[PDB]
Design a protein around this ligand. Structure first.
Ligand SMILES: *O[C@H]1[C@@H](O)[C@H](n2cnc3c(N)ncnc32)O[C@@H]1COP(=O)(O)OP(=O)(O)OP(=O)(O)OC[C@H]1O[C@@H](n2c[n+](C)c3c(=O)[nH]c(N)nc32)[C@H](O)[C@@H]1O
Ligand SMILES: [Mg+2]
Lengths: 51, 729, 51
RNA sequence: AUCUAUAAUAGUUUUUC
RNA sequence: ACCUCUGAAUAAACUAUU
RNA sequence: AGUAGUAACAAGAG
């Protein structure tokens, strides 16, 4: 099996949800430092390139 | 003085002062990797492109004084153009090959010392011995092997700390060498490298080459030691084996490990023969371990192991009925055991199978720093009497005894992420994992073991969970104290009895683990695979049946009894579980007899698949079998009686029989093959007639066929998702 | 003051100077009310709190 | 019996209408 | 127009080597 | 023209 457009269909919000479930009962700082990456990825911008 | 003057010079310049002040030591690495950007994307193309240039090579500015601008033919050797981002100049490869013929000459006498590992490789190849090349059915297995042996009792981090201590004493930081191995190696290398005239960085790299272990997964056959891995391309192939022995000096621990592996294989194979003793002797005389005869090694090796001691006893040598467990030499003074696999639930919620030794037994434990007397029952420690040296020695002895006792408390004391499979999902030894886990931190084990008041007998002290010598209560059944080969006779069935007459060893006591040898084990006989691993044994057994199919078929048709008694099937029979050997043999023999009496139902592939299972003494039962198990690396791999299987799959398109993924050869169609879809060697007392027939009601299972009677046709879900019509003769 | 084996390495003049500097710092901190909070926080000092 | 050193370099793998 | 410069470095994991 | 293929090269910059 292959998956069609895995990275164009997966969402950073779902990765944030996964990280939130994984880091239950953990110190707050650890949860924050892990959560920053999905948050920044759900607000990401893409350079268009050369033109 | 020169250093401080240069630093003062750099602090006087404005930009260098800014760099030196604003850059911390942590950011020194960042500025050290700082670059304008080396636009290298296709280095092969870039090198091919640059070698067409006039000056593709950089060199220090001293080349303008060490090498002339032009040679005899006037060809230019260097130019004054500087390299980008540096003061190095641009030179031609002609400059390098001019240096190699006209440059100043220095003394290269320390090079063999600095690069001792590579010249050691050269010496090992130079003095190596080549044997014959044997074309065989190679079965390589992906395993972790060491490519750089380093030092035995060291890890990469410990080796690095030792190297830092030896070479850079004032840069070690907070590390203190704790292991006695580290202290010994540190003293040895400090003395050896005393007054050394090599650059400290080069010395550190030498010590890295000498002391740092490196292991990798490779598809390996033969020995897994470094001296054999470095020539693995030379010695092992897909269809051939090149006999070869490295010319250096062989480590003795490798010899011990390989001897244990060979002895276990030989004993296990011999247990299934008609005369185990003669088979064991003729196998030990035909076995070589790293270019050395096995009998000589047995005569000059003090290894405490059950199979090794059985091999020694078979040759009239004196044995020490001992074994090793967790760094201690155990010896059973009195008692007996029978192994039994029991599934247990670990403290960290892991399910695993542990070989449990039944019966009451007594032992003595001997270690390099501690000694103990142990009495135990089935998964229960009766008492332990340790007489170690210091606190840590007694702690280690107590931990080893607790793990050996197989106490359910010890199992439930497991915490953390303790894995019982390899990083490649290879099953590990549970006892070894428990030892390694509790030798890191045993506070929970001691806490959950319990406590017990002591009666002050003989002044033997008690011990508390935090390792203190109490006099009132101690660990449950644990007491603290203060501080030989025997002639044996071995039976026909490898039963070793002392001079008095008591049993000391037996084949059942031999470990069932199937390990691999550090040094290549060469076996010289008709079957070079007779003491090989289970995969090679299976593949070579079925290939032997395929190659000899003509006379094997004739014998099966005429005199099956002699066919079942071939010595070639015995390595196979060493893989069948002991309790099921007779049942499988009887079932397969009944299948064969029905196959003979029902003409036209002659399935060649069925006979080939089921023949090796008929080599055991038959036991007659009415149990039906849809699959027969074979032990391969600890997991029972089933061979399905009807249809293909992971172990045994026959491809009708290619007529090629593949076993465990290894080609075993191509069959040829017999004239008496049944081209009618009629099967007689699938059910013990039922003959398959055809496909689904709805007239006879619903389909039932193979395990419920006893109620059927003569001629009662029925539909059975025999095989992988198939329903067929069967009838009873 | 205390020391191992009652061994005071320096002479009593320098030790008294250290004592008077510590007394001066305590007086200055008590002049602002910070001394009580300073005293109560000593137990929770050598435990890094990741934030 | 266990067995992810650190770092550097190169190579390999990882597609909608 | 002469002249002068220049011939082009994704991510992650892994493997090999040091 | 040609290479080439979803966008370029068929010199660029000072
Ligand atoms: O590398 C493997 C092997 O070659 C190596 N080894 C074995 N012997 C030596 C010596 N003598 N020197 C150096 N190296 C040696 O150790 C490795 C063993 O691996 P593996 O074969 O997987 O383990 P093994 O099957 O030997 O089981 P193990 O856990 O190590 O136990 C060894 C021995 O102890 C017996 N035993 C355990 N218990 C709990 C027993 C018991 O309650 N009662 C009795 N009678 N015996 C018990 C095991 O069955 C083995 O006999
Ligand atoms: Mg795929």
């Amino acid at each position: 099996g292959d998956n069609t457009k895995w990275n164009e269909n997966q969402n950073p919000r779902m990765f944030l949800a996964m990280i939130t479930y994984i880091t239950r009962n953990q110190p707050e700082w650890f949860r924050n430092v892990l959560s920053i990456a999905p948050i920044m990825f759900s607000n990401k911008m893409a350079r268009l390139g050369k033109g | 003085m020169e250093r401080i003057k240069e630093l003062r010079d750099l602090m006087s310049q404005s930009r260098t002062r800014e760099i030196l002040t604003k850059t911390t030591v942590d950011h020194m690495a960042i500025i050290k990797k700082y670059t304008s950007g080396r636009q290298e994307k296709n280095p092969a193309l870039r090198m091919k492109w640059m070698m067409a240039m006039k000056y593709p090579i950089t060199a220090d500015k001293r080349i303008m004084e060490m090498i002339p601008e032009r040679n005899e033919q006037g060809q230019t050797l260097w130019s004054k153009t500087n390299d980008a981002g540096s003061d190095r100049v641009m030179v031609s490869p002609l400059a390098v090959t001019w240096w190699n013929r006209n440059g100043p000459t220095t003394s290269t006498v320390h090079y063999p010392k600095v690069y001792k590992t590579y010249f050691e490789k050269v010496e090992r190849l130079k003095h190596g011995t080549f044997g014959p090349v044997h074309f065989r059915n190679q079965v390589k297995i992906r395993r972790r092997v060491d490519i750089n042996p380093g030092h035995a009792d060291l890890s990469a981090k410990e080796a690095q700390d030792v190297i830092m201590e030896v070479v850079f004493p004032n840069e070690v930081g907070a590390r203190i060498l704790t292991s006695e191995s580290q202290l010994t190696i540190t003293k040895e290398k400090k003395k050896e490298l005393q007054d050394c005239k090599i650059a400290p960085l080069m010395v550190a790299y030498m010590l890295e080459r000498e002391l740092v272990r490196k292991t990798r997964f490779l598809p390996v056959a033969g020995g897994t030691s470094s001296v054999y891995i470095e020539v693995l391309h030379l010695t092992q192939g897909t269809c051939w084996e090149q006999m070869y022995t490295p010319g250096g000096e062989v480590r003795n621990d490798d010899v011990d490990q390989s001897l244990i592996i060979a002895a276990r294989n030989i004993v296990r194979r011999a247990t299934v023969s008609a005369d185990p003793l003669a088979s064991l002797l003729e196998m030990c005389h035909s076995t070589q371990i790293g270019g050395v005869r096995m009998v000589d090694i047995l005569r000059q090796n003090p290894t405490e192991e059950q199979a090794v001691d059985i091999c020694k006893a078979a040759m009239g040598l004196r044995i020490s009925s001992s074994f090793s467990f967790g760094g201690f030499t155990f010896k059973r003074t009195s008692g007996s055991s029978v192994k039994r696999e029991e599934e247990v639930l670990t403290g960290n919620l892991q399910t695993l199978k542990i070989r449990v030794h039944e019966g009451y037994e007594e032992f003595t434990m001997v270690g390099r720093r501690a000694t103990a007397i142990l009495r135990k029952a089935t998964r229960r420690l009766i008492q332990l009497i340790v007489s170690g040296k210091d606190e840590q020695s007694i702690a280690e002895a107590i931990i080893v005894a607790m793990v050996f006792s197989q106490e359910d408390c010890m199992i439930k004391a497991v915490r953390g992420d303790l894995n019982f499979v390899n990083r490649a999902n290879q099953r590990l030894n549970p006892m070894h994992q428990l030892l390694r886990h509790f030798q890191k931190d045993a506070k929970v084990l001691f806490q959950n073991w319990g406590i017990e008041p002591i009666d002050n007998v003989m002044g033997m002290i008690g011990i508390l969970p935090d390792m203190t010598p109490s006099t009132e209560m101690s660990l449950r059944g644990v007491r603290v104290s203060k501080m030989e080969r025997v002639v044996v006779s071995i039976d026909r069935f490898l039963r070793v009895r002392d001079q008095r007459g008591n049993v000391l060893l037996s084949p059942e006591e031999v470990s069932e683990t199937q390990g691999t040898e550090k040094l290549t084990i060469t076996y010289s006989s008709s079957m070079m695979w007779e003491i090989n691993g289970p995969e090679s044994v299976l593949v070579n057994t079925y290939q032997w049946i395929i190659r000899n199919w003509e006379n094997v078929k004739i014998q099966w048709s005429q005199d099956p009894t002699m066919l079942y008694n071939k010595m070639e099937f015995e390595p196979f029979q060493s893989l069948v579980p002991k309790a099921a050997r007779g049942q499988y043999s009887g079932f397969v023999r009944v299948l064969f007899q029905q196959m003979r009496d029902v003409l036209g139902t002659f399935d060649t592939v069925q006979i080939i698949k089921l023949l090796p299972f008929a080599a055991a003494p038959p036991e007659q039962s009415r149990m039906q079998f849809s699959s027969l198990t074979v032990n391969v690396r600890g997991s029972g791999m089933r061979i399905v009686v009807r249809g293909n299987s992971p172990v045994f799959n026959y491809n009708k398109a290619t007529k090629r029989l593949t076993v465990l993924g290894k080609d075993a050869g191509a069959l040829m169609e017999d004239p008496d093959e049944g081209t009618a879809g009629v099967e007689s060697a699938v059910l013990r007392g039922f003959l398959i007639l055809g496909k689904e027939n709805k007239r006879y009601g619903p389909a039932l299972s193979i395990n419920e066929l006893s109620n059927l009677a003569k001629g009662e046709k029925a539909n059975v879900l025999i095989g992988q998702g198939d329903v067929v019509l069967v009838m009873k003769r | 003051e205390m020391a191992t084996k009652a061994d005071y390495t320096l002479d009593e003049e320098s030790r008294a100077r250290i004592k008077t500097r510590l007394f001066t710092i305590r007086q200055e901190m008590a002049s602002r009310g910070l001394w009580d909070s300073f005293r109560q926080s000593e137990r929770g000092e050598e435990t890094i709190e990741e934030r």
